[model samples]
Target: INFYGELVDLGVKEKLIEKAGAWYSYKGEKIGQGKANATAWLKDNPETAKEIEKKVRELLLSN
Candidate 1:
């Protein structure tokens, strides 16, 4: 149902943090960093999560 369908791997979540230069924070703080933080924030708010996840998916696919 997604743009990339099942081709999209949630595992890319880690790589996405690295791409945005926040891997350390995500790993160290046990939470995402930079924009990734915002993504997590979106998780608490589904409406926003949709938009954030879309952007994250785009970033991950670009890699």
Candidate 2:
């Protein structure tokens, strides 16, 4: 789903990238992992999270 790409498009920064483990590279950089971590951030950033959710729903429904 190009999650990281989508996050970048939505303007996710270092904090979110770290929380969601959404790094663009994979050169042994699989750290800062966990959906729970991302969820925690999302819970705090409801508006941004909602934007992400909206995009996801649109993608799903379009297909």
Candidate 3:
């Protein structure tokens, strides 16, 4: 959930996520929304997911 906010800060559109039906689109591809599916998506798209993950780390580390 917080990671989703990080995605938005990193330029992921809020509307796109809102319109999703348990699947978020990134780079025009369907990405899984929940924990399990999101983990699968992360494994499948490491490069893209890395960008998002980095942002999450950055924000979280900021305290």
Q: Considering every candidate listed, which one attains the maximal lDDT?
A: 3
Alpha-carbon runs more than 4 Å astray in model 1: 1-41, 60-63
User: Alpha carbon lDDT of residue 3, candidate 2?
Assistant: 53
Ranking 2 against 3 by lDDT, winner: 3
- Give the C-alpha miss distance for residue 34 in model 3, angstroms: 1.0
State, as a TM-score between 0 and 1, how close model 3 is to the true structure.
0.40
TM-scores, each model vs. reference: 0.27, 0.39, 0.40
- Model 1 steric clash pairs: none
Candidate 2 stretches with Cα past 4 Å from truth are 1-32
Off by over 4 Å in 3: 1-21, 24-28, 60-63
Q: TM-score: which candidate is best? A: 3
Clash-forming residue pairs, model 2? none
Error of 3 at 44 (Å): 1.4
RMSD of 3: 6.3
Q: What digit string (tens of lDDT, one per residue) describes model 2 on residues 1-63?
A: 335444533434333333334433211233223432334444345555555545555645677
Please state the error at residue 51 of candidate 2 in Å: 1.0
Predicted candidate 1 versus true structure: per-residue lDDT over 1-63, tens digit per residue: 332212112324433222334432222233344443533532344543344345566755678
- How many pairs collide in each candidate, listed in order? 0, 0, 0
Among all windows of 10 consecutive residues in model 2, the one with the lowest summed lDDT is 24-33
lDDT of each: 0.37, 0.41, 0.48
